[model samples]
Target: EHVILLNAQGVPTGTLEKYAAHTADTRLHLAFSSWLFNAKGQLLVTRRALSKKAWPGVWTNSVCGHPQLGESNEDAVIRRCRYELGVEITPPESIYPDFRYRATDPSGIVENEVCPVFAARTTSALQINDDEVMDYQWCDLADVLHGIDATPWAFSPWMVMQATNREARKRLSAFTQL
Candidate 1:
């Protein structure tokens, strides 16, 4: 089935068969997002294309995508960066907190997701794919933090994690400075 399933309330209930009744909306597979920072210390954000099945036309991290079934989270990040963003990234040395969120589409169909956050720094040039993203811009971390709060409807709890916690700030000093 095109829709991978979860329990009625969005718990990981497992894959639903193609012939199974569409009694409940499916959950998105576990995924990772890279909070890519440049030498100038700006966070790269992308505008998801309106064509996306979930959260289309929304601004998200530089790179984000679902892990292939049975693939480790780290491997998934590497694969997705190449596939989705056309950038080569090193597998994350550490991972951040796991997050769960749900959003509805124009059709009122709910899309639930369990996303694992990851942060990494790289100097490689980005060869962004135009299909999934309409455009991107680099912004100061402080601005991004403030923007998230000023527009709560623009984000989910998963996104709020970094915006609200000062202690959560990565040193990133060894690699880049703001």
Candidate 2:
């Protein structure tokens, strides 16, 4: 089981529990995500695993995975790169962990997550894990925003913010297509 808490740096912390009851009052969690960019400057996106408890079958960041108890964040990222994306990547030296929201849907379930976002540029041919991904695509970020603005399909709020917000765009990477 995963318990949700915060570290001194304000990142979500997670620990394994012997039993679900053991962590009834605990608060710690760990989740990592990648915003992958290719040499061609296109971003890769993945449709989430259908078995996910929340946001199942939805397209989100390139990669997102939970760290195993006692596993280093770096190991977790490398492991996920192999497990989820079916390839390998040397993750950046540091990840930007932002604790943005602690909200739930109107249904009153715990929809909370503390996400550490990492950015990476890779050129290796990817061998995607079909079990974790329903579909994959490399899309120009600008085109994604424009396509949505002109037609407006469903999109995650955070992705939309990262895509359009000027400072957020500038803070993350130097690759600018828009």
> Which candidate comes out best when scored by lDDT?
1
Question: In candidate 2, what are the lDDT values of residues 58-104, reduced to their tens digit?
Answer: 66667765656677766777777778787666554443556343333
Task: Extract clashing residue pairs from model 2.
Answer: 3-28, 4-27, 4-28, 5-27, 5-28, 13-28, 13-29
User: What is candidate 1's lDDT per residue for 1-178, written digit by digit as tens?
Assistant: 2324455454555664432322246445455566777656677777788776666777766676665556776787787666666776555644455455665645555545566667666557777777877888887767777777798567533456544544345532232543
Q: List where candidate 1 sits over 4 angstroms from the true fold.
A: 1-13, 16-24, 93-95, 155-158, 165-178
* C-alpha lDDT of candidate 2 relative to the true structure: 0.59
Best by TM-score: 1
Model 2, residue 47: what's the lDDT?
78
Model 1 collision count: 0
Task: State candidate 1's TM-score.
Answer: 0.74
